[PDB]
Design a protein around this ligand. Structure first.
Ligand SMILES: [Zn+2]
Ligand SMILES: [Zn+2]
Lengths: 195, 47, 66
């Protein structure tokens, strides 16, 4: 592997990562590809995807929002990164040479061309993967975990659910919390309607 | 390359649903979703 | 469901008078006076503002998103 054009085949752009924010096997299909993480002025450094991590900071990336990190490493220098800093630009000649030099200095053997050839098909086959298994439930659970509930049309459904939970729960503290949450939701809905 | 995009019932969020797949919203999870308007030349005469 | 654009019988433009008619009714005027204040002489065109029902509001309550 000595060309940039062949190396850009497995480059995971910022638009493709938005479709696997909650798909399983994220540590298998993603581990192996390279990304053009932006460091910051326009200089970029290619880093290897060692694995997957989870950050405690929740940030929104356009439409969706994820808090998962990405444990990268460039030769020897490693630290936590985020999926929002990745750029969509392809590996330039200067950055390609910089990455080659970093790999040679770090002693990490360059991945063989056949390795990239057989790895680039992983993303292609995962993209057209039929969601026949019970993965949609986990996806929706993860999405709703961070995504706040009131938005946008489920206000009445959420209010009914809160009332039902409060009625079912015989505890005093839980009842008070449910009543307070219901009152807050009703007040927010009234304010939105008035606006 | 048309994955037959749909519109969630209550989320009013787009979804990509292909054949032999469950009909549910990508988030929350509902069982209702409508289609999107055609792209054809919808031309009326203001008569 | 929405104010027509023209009087069925006459043809005089009446669509652009619903907001004005509502404002005139709101401030102080009465219908019989507001109608001629807007300039609706023929009784055929007055039924447009008197009889018209405003359902578009109820329709807008069912906001698709947000
Ligand atoms: Zn759903
Ligand atoms: Zn008339």
């Amino acid at each position: 592997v000595s060309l940039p054009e062949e190396l850009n085949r497995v480059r995971l752009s910022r638009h493709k990562l938005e479709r696997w924010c909650h798909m399983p096997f994220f540590a298998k299909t993603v581990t192996g590809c390279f990304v053009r993480i932006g460091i910051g002025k326009p200089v970029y450094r290619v880093a290897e995807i060692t694995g997957v991590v989870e950050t405690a900071k929740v940030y929104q990336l356009g439409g969706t929002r994820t808090n998962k990190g990405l444990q990268l490493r460039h030769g020897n220098d490693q630290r936590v990164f985020r999926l929002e800093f990745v750029s969509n630009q392809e590996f330039t000649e200067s950055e390609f040479m910089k990455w080659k030099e970093a790999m040679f200095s770090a002693g990490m053997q360059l991945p063989t061309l056949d390795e990239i050839n057989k790895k680039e098909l992983s993303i292609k086959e995962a993209l057209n993967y039929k969601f026949n298994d019970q993965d949609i439930e986990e996806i929706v659970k993860e999405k709703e975990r961070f995504r706040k509930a009131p938005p946008n049309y489920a206000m009445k459904k959420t209010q009914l659910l809160k009332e039902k939970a409060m009625a079912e729960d015989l505890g005093d503290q839980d009842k008070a919390k449910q009543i307070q949450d219901q009152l807050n939701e009703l007040e927010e809905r009234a304010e939105a309607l008035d606006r | 390359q048309q994955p037959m995009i749909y519109i969630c019932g209550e989320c009013h969020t787009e979804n990509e649903i292909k054949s032999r797949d469950p009909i549910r919203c990508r988030e929350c999870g509902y069982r209702i979703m409508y289609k999107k308007r055609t792209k054809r030349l919808v031309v009326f005469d203001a008569r | 469901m929405i104010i027509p654009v023209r009087c069925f019988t006459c043809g005089k433009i009446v669509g652009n008078k619903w907001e004005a008619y509502l404002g005139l009714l709101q401030a102080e005027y009465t219908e019989g006076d507001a109608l001629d204040a807007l300039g609706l002489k023929r009784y055929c065109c007055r039924r447009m503002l008197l009889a018209h029902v405003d359902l578009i509001e109820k329709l807008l309550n069912y906001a698709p998103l947000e």
